[PDB]
Amino acid sequence: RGWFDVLDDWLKRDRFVFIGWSGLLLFPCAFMALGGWLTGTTFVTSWYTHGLASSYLEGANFLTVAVSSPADAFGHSLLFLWGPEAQGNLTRWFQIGGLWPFVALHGAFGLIGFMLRQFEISRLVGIRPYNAIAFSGPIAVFVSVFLMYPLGQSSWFFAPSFGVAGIFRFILFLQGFHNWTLNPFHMMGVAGILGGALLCAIHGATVENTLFEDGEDSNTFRAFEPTQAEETYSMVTANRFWSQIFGIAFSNKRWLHFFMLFVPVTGLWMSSVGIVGLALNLRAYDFVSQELRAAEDPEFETFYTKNILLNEGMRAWMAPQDQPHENFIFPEEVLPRGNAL
Amino acid sequence: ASLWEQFCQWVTSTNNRIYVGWFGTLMIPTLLTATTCFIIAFIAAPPVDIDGIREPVAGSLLYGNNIISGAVVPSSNAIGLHFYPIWEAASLDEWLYNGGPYQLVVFHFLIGIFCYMGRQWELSYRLGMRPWICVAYSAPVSAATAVFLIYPIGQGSFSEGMPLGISGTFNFMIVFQAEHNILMHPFHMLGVAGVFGGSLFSAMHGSLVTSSLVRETTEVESQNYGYKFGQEEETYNIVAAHGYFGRLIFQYASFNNSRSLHFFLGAWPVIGIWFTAMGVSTMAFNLNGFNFNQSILDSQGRVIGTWADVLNRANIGFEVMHERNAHNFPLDLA
Amino acid sequence: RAWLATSHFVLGFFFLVGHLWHAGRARAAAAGFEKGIDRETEPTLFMPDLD
Amino acid sequence: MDRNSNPNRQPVELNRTSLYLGLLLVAVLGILFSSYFFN
Amino acid sequence: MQVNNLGFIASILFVLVPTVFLLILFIQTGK
């Protein structure tokens, strides 16, 4: 017995927590990312990077804590603990926001390890690896949003902070500065996510309401056993119902479930392509025909032009606080505002 | 035998290609009316004075909009919650100016989708089904009623209802955030949990079923031809899928009963969308999202910002610029 | 007013959901198919095809 | 040299449901991207 | 409106090229 094959035996035992070869990448990296996030949201400030309190130690709550992005002065420095910024000082590393690339990098390598775990367990069990192919969507989202968006921007500062209200800030920032709702790549993402939620709800309700009477109890859940051969619900009845209700219906179970896979994964990939565009400020910010008309004609108003005005107001009122390294002094008279508010 | 009984048998027939039913006898006229008026208004309605301040907003394609910016603009703020049909207008042009098409489309659409939910029950009853598909459909219905009816009622004007367009929806959402802080509302958070988890679990279910398909085709043809419509037997190995998923996380996190799995798949996004419908319906009465602004002070008393304070700066910037010409007083009371 | 209106609107909605759940289950149980479709007498299997 | 028949030739199929799904996808992609093409 | 001069040709080709591809594939199916 070779030592590699003995180690392969030990790593792929049937235990409570499967390890595998992928676990050597997954578990230390996922533990580092999760412990870094919990450590930062419990103890670590954003006072020197953002001028903000973002830990439970400062009095923030679960909504208002974050592992915030590092200072804009560092650019896209990877901000290693031993790196030229922190210089080995753990306290300085915490204060300059090094927990953000710590969490983001270990998280990215843990996500790699998780899709590798999906591949490894799919190979061992003997099934096709479509769970890993489906998980390509979340990794596309993580790579485009937390990595390539700040890389395209000036620093890691403009990456989303690992927090609830920090993510809400990133979301509103992308509305006001990028017009990300107007981007068709995000619209395909929204369509994919709402379609995935629709398909989940409709598929579950259809199965639960086309169940076969396979038991004597009103509790229908005990009328199923996993080792049975026949279908637990009537695809014919479900097909007839949705054909007469909606006009069309699924007639193929395998196509139904591939579509349930396909819709949100494709939405995530499309929104990722849009975030890649936004990394370089390649926005769908404006419809130039409507601005040219609105500049020439003061009677022309659409909901698009109203959204443009909303974005301008948000940018001017948020940027001095959201980007304190820039020292944006906007006196009150230059702030755009409507009548009386 | 009777003419009425013959009509009742035709109406309730399961042999109709599209099921009508008694709910369909209300659904079909209302939905056809709303569809026809929406299409005509989206293409060719004149501009609508939504804020009631004689500042008409071009909503239709013939007046300079594209598909993204086009909308059926909500009725005038001067109307408020007043019932504004065609026969209450002195002319059709006045009706178009004051946003009557929005009221017509929205009222017939809301009746139609409530009758769609009733019809879903009706056909499940005629087909010998269990009846709770309409309960799952009640979550999008509640969300639609929240944004088209309940939010206007609580705000006191149908001008506050979501516009029937893409950029109009974005405008509704941005003004909603600036006024109610919906992102900080936990019901919206539950809705985001519902849609993110529903898409997650849709991807999971689909990926596990596609992963555990029984080999019934060659490598040339599509694997979907391994399933025959109306086959008795299972098209995929649930035990293999459970073995994979209980090794991917751990054994007791994986469903083995397909009925519990599908009840969970139904229940998660439906409950999430119910909660977010109630969140929008409760911010109709101005019960807003969490206000943590200036919640952290130092020992002197100076405000230490958090991410909620930056979010509030964004909300203020959205608020001071919204309906720029409609406000005359210092507070946006509704 | 805000608390009372919000609470009672949420309760009214969830009680409409209860009506739908119980009205449908009452009809299904009085009709005899609240526990699922009988395999031998599945009603759709005796209907003509839609097209 | 001789021109021999290739035995790796295989027919392509697209069923009617796939045709409808593709036509709807192409139509909605046109609907989505036409406003940005016009700008 | 002052639109892109190529917007009409891009929209028609973006719709019509894969429409043609799908129609070609559907009509030949069964051969």
């Binding site: 054909s243 | 594209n66 598909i67 | 097209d51 | 009617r16 | 929209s11």
Partner: peptide
């Protein structure tokens, strides 16, 4: 003239919807 293009693409989607409902491949039990 962009309005013609928008009307055509919306009409193509609605025609696809009609032909997919009215002229679907019928689901057959076999």
């Amino acid at each position: 003239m962009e309005s013609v293009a928008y009307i055509l693409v919306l009409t193509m989607a609605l025609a696809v919807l009609f032909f997919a409902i009215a002229f679907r491949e019928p689901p057959r039990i076999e």
